[PDB]
Design a protein around this ligand. Sequence first.
Ligand SMILES: Nc1ncnc2c1ncn2[C@@H]1O[C@H](COP(=O)(O)OP(=O)(O)NP(=O)(O)O)[C@@H](O)[C@H]1O
Ligand SMILES: Nc1ncnc2c1ncn2[C@@H]1O[C@H](COP(=O)(O)OP(=O)(O)NP(=O)(O)O)[C@@H](O)[C@H]1O
Ligand SMILES: O=C(C[C@H]1NCCC[C@@H]1O)Cn1cnc2cc(Br)c(Cl)cc2c1=O
Ligand SMILES: O=C(C[C@H]1NCCC[C@@H]1O)Cn1cnc2cc(Br)c(Cl)cc2c1=O
Ligand SMILES: [Mg+2]
Ligand SMILES: [Mg+2]
Ligand SMILES: [Zn+2]
Ligand SMILES: [Zn+2]
Lengths: 482, 484
Amino acid sequence: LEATKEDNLPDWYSQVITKGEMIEYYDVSGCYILRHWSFAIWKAIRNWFDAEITRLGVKECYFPIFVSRAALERDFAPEVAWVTKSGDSELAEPIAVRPTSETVMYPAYAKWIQSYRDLPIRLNQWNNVVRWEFKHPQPFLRTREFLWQEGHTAFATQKEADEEVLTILDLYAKVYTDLLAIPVVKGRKTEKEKFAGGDYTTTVEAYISASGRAIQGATSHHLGQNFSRMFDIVYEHPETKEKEYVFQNSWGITTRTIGVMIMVHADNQGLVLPPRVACIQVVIVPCGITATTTDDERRRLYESCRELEQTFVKAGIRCEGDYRDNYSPGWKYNHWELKGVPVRIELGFKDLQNDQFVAVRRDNGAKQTIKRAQATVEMPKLLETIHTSMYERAERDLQSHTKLTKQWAEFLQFLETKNIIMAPFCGEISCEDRIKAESAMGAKSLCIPFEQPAKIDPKVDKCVHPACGRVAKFYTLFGRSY
Amino acid sequence: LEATKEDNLPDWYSQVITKGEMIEYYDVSGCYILRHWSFAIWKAIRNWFDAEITRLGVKECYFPIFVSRAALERDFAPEVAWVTKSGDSELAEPIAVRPTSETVMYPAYAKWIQSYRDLPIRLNQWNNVVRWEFKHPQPFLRTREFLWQEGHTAFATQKEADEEVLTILDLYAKVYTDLLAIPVVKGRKTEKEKFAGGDYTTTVEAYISASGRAIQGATSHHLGQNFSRMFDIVYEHPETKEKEYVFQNSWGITTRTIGVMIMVHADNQGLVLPPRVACIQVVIVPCGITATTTDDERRRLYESCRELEQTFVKAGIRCEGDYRDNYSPGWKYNHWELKGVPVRIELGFKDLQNDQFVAVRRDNGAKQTIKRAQATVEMPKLLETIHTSMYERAERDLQSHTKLTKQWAEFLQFLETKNIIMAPFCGEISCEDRIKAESAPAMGAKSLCIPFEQPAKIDPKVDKCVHPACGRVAKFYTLFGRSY
Ligand SMILES: Nc1ncnc2c1ncn2[C@@H]1O[C@H](COP(=O)(O)OP(=O)(O)NP(=O)(O)O)[C@@H](O)[C@H]1O
Ligand SMILES: Nc1ncnc2c1ncn2[C@@H]1O[C@H](COP(=O)(O)OP(=O)(O)NP(=O)(O)O)[C@@H](O)[C@H]1O
Ligand SMILES: O=C(C[C@H]1NCCC[C@@H]1O)Cn1cnc2cc(Br)c(Cl)cc2c1=O
Ligand SMILES: O=C(C[C@H]1NCCC[C@@H]1O)Cn1cnc2cc(Br)c(Cl)cc2c1=O
Ligand SMILES: [Mg+2]
Ligand SMILES: [Mg+2]
Ligand SMILES: [Zn+2]
Ligand SMILES: [Zn+2]
């Protein structure tokens, strides 16, 4: 590993994603070959979330990657990738590679709702979407093609919609903290940062101390009746028949997760995978095989290592051994340290003589010896222990970069000191622009958190800036972002 | 269903796939909205095959949907979709939507095999691909975007490659016979119909009698060293430091599976889904209505039906009840019969009094009464019974359309009356072209495959090719017929 995380972050990240065997750079700018290592992490995330939402009643479909011009046109216009040509023959009308599927799914929804009896609609797509991002692309954070799931739901009454938005958001937050061991702040986005066609938007924000910047981890919007008016998704009331518009929601999460994991956990020696998503959770690395190693002893070692690995598998542990005779044990140590496998097993001849083995943690590198009887009990403890110690390590990190203040001056102080700031705010868009302006790379709104620091005292509290709406409507989290 | 399968096949196919709620037609020609129902079918096939191939050891990755012009340019040119514009701004280089990934994965392979020690590389991706086909598209058989799985593999020795080719081909055929209940002919593709960049091509062909045509259900190719040579996928031989090229396969299967399912099994009342991929295997339909609704009895009926479906799901059976108030039991009957649910459950107040229910089969409409204790046993047996009755009927159909001959004249007779033929063949492509011509959306006859189960030795003492003008090698038997 060539670069360090603290000095020269972009090339630390590059080094990690390549020497960790998750990326291969690709000759269409801003898209990246996904290797087995990364893709398994995405599979773990995808599988948990789909089990969750299929338990809830969301069904799965798939709309085509292509969107007609006419479909799309009824403004992110500069972000649309256009097929214009089939080979050498130029196309009558161009077709667009999808960025999202509202334009295609909501007309379908108008067609599928023939009566009140057809509601609710709860569909989800696991697909890939292409946005010709103008902002600097980063290998997992912002790729021009990315894989995600997008769910679009239609409801009779607004209660169902509000409840599902929050349900999905709790799911998203659990993906972050329970799968990837990352702390996140749940909140509402301001009127400036909400999804334009929506009503309100929930988010799950995370903070990179390295970058000093925060990043949106997923979104769950409540669309209200905005789109159902746009696309005329209506039904007649069963009693007192009158044209009623349905209530909608949409939500999404992407491979950005992997990037956020990297940024939060990887150290200066490679990746550090959260145990619950790591492809290989335990790797056994046989050692002690000197020059004078009688081939019977090398076979005996290999036999015991394979027996240990499979008794791990039977106890539900993703464990593999590394028995390649072309590499030294120390080489194997480094290799798997870059791949960030949570626990390495060291099984030498002396450990064999004692019916034990030594486990080494990828975070903090602590060694600890374990007898082979307790293998199926200690090892899962250790995996959970690692998860917690990762999450807490990051959570304390977040808590040390969040400062609360009611003054602009020390707001700017904090912002320059590489941390994000909780301050009272009016919410007004003009003022939010003024804050970002006078902070320059300037300070953006992250979300209005669900957990407020204090109740706002209306006779006292004021906004964090000079003109505003004056009266503080709530506390908002602000900071530099991705 | 307005139209019949027998008269007006295309319009029947449209009616079943729409009123069965799997397709939604789409305003970009040759793409089709996959509704929840069909996609559940695809999901089952995918999970089965993925369990299988990752158990064998194939790993999964994901390359971008976009291909550099240069990558791709290093025949099918009119089928490539080109992104040229990002909104307003035209792009530096144009990019192509992937049509397959050899052009892109094999350079990575060349970068990834640094030694003999890195071998074998056995990768799979589940992804979507686009081809602007020059043929009329039909909703699952040939779509302009379609989803698939492509597996690409590289091996030190040719033996490993041959073996995986055949293993994978067996897995494809199992998807067809164990999952979709369709009988399929394993074979080798002729020199004319094999994949051009390959060595040989295996296939699994299936026959739809409605259209009287065969269709390729999947492919497993042996690329040998042709692609390893193009892209210089090499390693240094261990004993002798000398450049050795790897041996490769690639194989793939697409959403066409669902189409052949539809074509082979659905009747003139809608779908008939095979039990092992059916999204709902059993639908429960109560039977008390109108004025006779002492609501206590309606709640008693609903609560016992939820108990039966719950005890069915816990025994791993995909069962849901249909309890909507709006509709009548006869409507729900017709609805789910369009959806091809293998067995419909009818549970009225009388069966309630007798601790029973009656199950009706979607394939025959045959009824059979079942007491509620034995439900946990009788239902899965019925699911197996229904499966094999589907496969067996389809196999009797295939066998009654497979005919064998050595005289060209009766080859043409058999083909003209809508069935497929197995005849002695030389293997030559010019001769195959003459065959296809002399039979005349291809109205001529194609080579389907050289079957693995040959009937009779094609012994050269006297055996000659079935065409009058061929160089009568009589190398083997080939299966011919109109195909998709
Ligand atoms: N290019 C991308 N690569 C990966 N994940 C992305 C990308 N763009 C957006 N996401 C994530 O996808 C979720 C839903 O997308 P969306 O809300 O449409 O993002 P967005 O408005 O474009 N955010 P931004 O990148 O700041 O413009 C967000 O919560 C992001 O975390
Ligand atoms: N447009 C399509 N839609 C769905 N399945 C397809 C399509 N084209 C090919 N297939 C299937 O996908 C598998 C792999 O594709 P491929 O090897 O390219 O077939 P192919 O050479 O294109 N045959 P052809 O349909 O005549 O062009 C084959 O087994 C086909 O049955
Ligand atoms: O895509 C969204 C909002 C939501 N869509 C459903 C899944 C979750 C997601 O947050 C916002 N957005 C973002 N980027 C876009 C890029 C283009 Br190009 C287009 Cl046309 C449209 C959009 C667009 O609407
Ligand atoms: O796609 C293939 C061969 C194999 N690729 C890997 C998955 C299994 C599959 O049988 C054949 N084929 C078919 N159609 C194509 C269309 C275009 Br456009 C291109 Cl460039 C290339 C191709 C092309 O190579
Ligand atoms: Mg964006
Ligand atoms: Mg083709
Ligand atoms: Zn203000
Ligand atoms: Zn011949």
